[PDB]
Design an enzyme around this catalytic site. Sequence first.
Site, short mmCIF file in Angstrom:
data_model
loop_
_atom_site.label_atom_id
_atom_site.label_comp_id
_atom_site.label_asym_id
_atom_site.label_seq_id
_atom_site.Cartn_x
_atom_site.Cartn_y
_atom_site.Cartn_z
N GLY A 48 -15.80 35.47 -35.37
CA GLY A 48 -16.13 34.47 -34.36
C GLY A 48 -17.57 34.01 -34.36
O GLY A 48 -18.44 34.74 -34.82
N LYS A 49 -17.81 32.80 -33.83
CA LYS A 49 -19.14 32.17 -33.68
C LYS A 49 -19.37 32.02 -32.15
O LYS A 49 -18.81 32.83 -31.39
CB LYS A 49 -19.17 30.79 -34.38
CG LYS A 49 -20.54 30.39 -34.95
CD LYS A 49 -20.45 29.24 -35.96
CE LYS A 49 -21.76 28.98 -36.68
NZ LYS A 49 -21.65 27.86 -37.65
N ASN A 101 -22.17 30.98 -28.65
CA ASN A 101 -23.43 30.82 -27.89
C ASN A 101 -24.73 31.23 -28.66
O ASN A 101 -25.59 31.96 -28.12
CB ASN A 101 -23.30 31.57 -26.55
N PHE A 102 -24.85 30.74 -29.93
CA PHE A 102 -25.92 30.94 -30.93
C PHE A 102 -25.89 32.36 -31.54
O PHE A 102 -26.85 32.81 -32.18
CB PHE A 102 -27.30 30.52 -30.38
CG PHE A 102 -27.25 29.12 -29.82
CD1 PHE A 102 -26.99 28.02 -30.64
CD2 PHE A 102 -27.43 28.89 -28.46
CE1 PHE A 102 -26.94 26.73 -30.12
CE2 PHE A 102 -27.39 27.59 -27.93
CZ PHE A 102 -27.14 26.52 -28.77
N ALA A 103 -24.74 33.03 -31.36
CA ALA A 103 -24.42 34.36 -31.84
C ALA A 103 -23.19 34.24 -32.74
O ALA A 103 -22.22 33.57 -32.38
CB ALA A 103 -24.12 35.27 -30.66
N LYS A 104 -23.23 34.88 -33.90
CA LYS A 104 -22.14 34.86 -34.87
C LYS A 104 -21.73 36.30 -35.12
O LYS A 104 -22.57 37.09 -35.56
CB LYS A 104 -22.60 34.23 -36.21
CG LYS A 104 -23.09 32.78 -36.14
CD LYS A 104 -24.30 32.49 -37.06
CE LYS A 104 -24.03 32.64 -38.55
NZ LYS A 104 -22.99 31.70 -39.06
N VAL A 105 -20.47 36.64 -34.85
CA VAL A 105 -19.98 38.00 -35.10
C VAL A 105 -19.29 38.00 -36.46
O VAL A 105 -18.20 37.45 -36.60
CB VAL A 105 -19.08 38.56 -33.97
CG1 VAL A 105 -18.79 40.03 -34.19
CG2 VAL A 105 -19.70 38.36 -32.60
N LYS A 145 -22.96 41.59 -34.98
CA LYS A 145 -23.27 40.51 -34.03
C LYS A 145 -24.67 39.97 -34.44
O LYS A 145 -25.62 40.76 -34.54
CB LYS A 145 -23.27 41.05 -32.59
CG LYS A 145 -23.04 40.00 -31.52
CD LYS A 145 -22.12 40.50 -30.42
CE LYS A 145 -22.02 39.45 -29.34
NZ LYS A 145 -21.05 39.80 -28.27
N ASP A 178 -17.77 42.16 -15.13
CA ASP A 178 -17.00 41.09 -15.76
C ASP A 178 -15.84 41.59 -16.65
O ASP A 178 -15.77 41.25 -17.83
CB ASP A 178 -17.95 40.15 -16.54
CG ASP A 178 -17.35 38.81 -16.93
OD1 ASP A 178 -17.04 38.01 -16.02
OD2 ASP A 178 -17.18 38.56 -18.15
C1 LIG Z 1 -18.73 43.26 -32.45
C2 LIG Z 1 -17.63 43.04 -31.43
C3 LIG Z 1 -17.74 44.02 -30.29
C4 LIG Z 1 -17.70 41.62 -30.90
O1 LIG Z 1 -18.68 41.10 -30.40
N1 LIG Z 1 -16.47 41.04 -31.11
C5 LIG Z 1 -16.25 39.61 -30.90
C6 LIG Z 1 -15.84 38.77 -32.12
C7 LIG Z 1 -14.64 37.92 -31.74
C8 LIG Z 1 -14.27 38.44 -30.40
C9 LIG Z 1 -13.17 38.11 -29.63
O2 LIG Z 1 -12.26 37.17 -30.05
C10 LIG Z 1 -12.99 38.73 -28.41
C11 LIG Z 1 -13.89 39.67 -27.95
C12 LIG Z 1 -14.99 40.00 -28.72
C13 LIG Z 1 -15.15 39.38 -29.94
C14 LIG Z 1 -15.61 41.88 -31.83
N2 LIG Z 1 -14.38 41.63 -32.27
C15 LIG Z 1 -13.79 42.63 -32.93
N3 LIG Z 1 -12.50 42.45 -33.43
C16 LIG Z 1 -11.68 41.29 -33.36
C17 LIG Z 1 -10.74 41.10 -34.35
C18 LIG Z 1 -9.92 39.99 -34.32
C19 LIG Z 1 -10.04 39.07 -33.30
C20 LIG Z 1 -10.97 39.24 -32.30
C21 LIG Z 1 -11.78 40.35 -32.34
N4 LIG Z 1 -14.35 43.83 -33.19
C22 LIG Z 1 -15.59 44.04 -32.73
C23 LIG Z 1 -16.26 43.06 -32.03
#
Ligand SMILES: CC1(C)C(=O)N([C@H]2C=Cc3c(O)cccc32)c2nc(Nc3ccccc3)ncc21
Length: 302
Positions: free
Chosen positions: A13-14, A16-20, A35, A128
Amino acid sequence: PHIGNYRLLKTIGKGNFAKVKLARHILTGKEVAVKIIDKTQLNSSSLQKLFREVRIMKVLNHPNIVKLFEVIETEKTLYLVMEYASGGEVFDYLVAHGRMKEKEARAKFRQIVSAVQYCHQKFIVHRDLKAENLLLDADMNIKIADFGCGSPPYAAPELFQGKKYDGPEVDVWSLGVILYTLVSGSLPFDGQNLKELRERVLRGKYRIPFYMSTDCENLLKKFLILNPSKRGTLEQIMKDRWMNVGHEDDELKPYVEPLPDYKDPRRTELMVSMGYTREEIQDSLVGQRYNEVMATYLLLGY
Ligand SMILES: CC1(C)C(=O)N([C@H]2C=Cc3c(O)cccc32)c2nc(Nc3ccccc3)ncc21
């Protein structure tokens, strides 16, 4: 594609200027979720809220909260190397599979209640809790997201009456919403307009699904209480009969944090061979630095 001891693979995911970005720890092969916050963008307030999250992540060690492994700091950007939850969002699971059976919902809810109580135990309030905010691992285990849109149906009544809104009993209301969503696949308090959403939330009355057990509905009555003071502590809601059906052996008790093992000889030799000194290993761990030495250690325990 390369930051530290990491190889960036996909992008989960992308925003609020943060890309995971989904990554792989190079020295251990272990999968992580990085992150990448561009601090230059972030407004004056969003930064304090980012630093408050960093501070919190560093303290929580629960099997149902995303673990933090490393913090890579630059002037312009911040790299938070956290635990990867493969299963994605619980919200997306509830839309894909519908409601969970009370048995299945109990399995996940025990994990949620334990992890949120453990936060309160260290005087940390999420404020939240959302279904989007809860993740699932490879084995369908809850992995609570981050601390810093479907934010309003989880809002406590005290939001609509201007009252304080700083306490942990805010999370108890929210947890009740989550329980309802987990067993029914829908929201207890709905509306088309926020005037409607407010009128329902403040009335405190919710729709009860014809299939819901008297025990489940009772637990909702332990969470969704209008006066915040009149709301039960997470430790007393843990003892609830619905919570312990099948767990007549193991009653839900507050999470007792495990003791530190900063001296494992397996992980320490591996790291000594890797060029790290026994000396820097212990210092990074005791100092809870979340540097490349600590991340190499935490990730080696898998
Ligand atoms: C680093 C951390 C904690 C984080 O920041 N996110 C983000 C990124 C996408 C997203 C979201 O879709 C929902 C909640 C958090 C997030 C994470 N998402 C995952 N797995 C995942 C796998 C498939 C779909 C969604 C999330 N694992 C760890 C994290």
